From Swiss-Prot:
The gene is pth. It is an enzyme of class 3 (hydrolase). The active site is at H22. One of its GO terms (biological process) is rescue of stalled ribosome. Transmembrane segments: none annotated. This is Peptidyl-tRNA hydrolase.
Length: 194
């Protein structure tokens, strides 16, 4: 029932982080911007890269924060407060240790389950966990202690391909996601296979 007004793709800025797994979110937004013909603008006001396109009579904004991951919430609150977008019109794309490459999933609400990007978003938005998430499988290294090194690495090529496939699947439910039909987007998405 609620149109999406903001899609955020999480990542770390900089060449040292480019192409790393923890930037899956931002890869998705970046593909989405390219497919939509949207330009993404270095906007210091929103501590990120911002673009917009028009969908069903409303501006949808795309955000890639350029704070570090752990401070993403600053970027998302600045944009969303400037524009008065409530959490429920926000979709955040992020890497997901709990699914393998090749798998994208959607979720509404819930915790951050250890993602410091989302945690920050959660704290910054006056503590609201009610935004939506596009979870992009990046696999898990199989030990809590290897997590930090893992999300910060570049996946081998098979895993990168399969992340890219999950991104193409995700983009196939763009119409359902922009409209806010999470159930249908879930039905279609969660029925694809990489």
């Amino acid at each position: 029932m609620t149109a999406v007004q903001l899609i955020v793709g999480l990542g770390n800025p900089g060449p040292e982080y480019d192409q790393t797994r923890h930037n899956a979110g931002a890869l998705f937004v970046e593909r989405l911007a390219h497919a939509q013909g949207v330009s993404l603008v270095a906007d210091r006001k929103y501590f990120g890269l911002v673009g917009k396109f028009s969908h069903q009579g409303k501006d949808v904004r795309l955000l890639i924060p350029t704070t570090y991951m752990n401070r993403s919430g600053q970027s998302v609150a600045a944009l969303a407060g400037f524009f008065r977008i409530a959490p429920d019109a926000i979709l955040v794309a992020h890497d997901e240790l709990d699914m393998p490459p090749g798998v994208a999933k959607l979720k509404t609400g819930g915790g951050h389950g250890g993602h410091n990007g989302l945690r920050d978003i959660i704290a910054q938005l006056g503590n609201q966990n009610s935004f939506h998430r596009l979870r992009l499988g990046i696999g898990h290294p199989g030990h809590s202690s290897l997590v930090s090194g893992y999300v910060l690495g570049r996946a081998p090529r098979s895993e990168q391909e399969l992340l890219d496939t999950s991104i193409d699947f995700a983009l196939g439910v763009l119409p359902e996601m922009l409209a806010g039909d999470w159930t249908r987007a879930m039905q279609k998405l969660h029925s694809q296979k990489a």
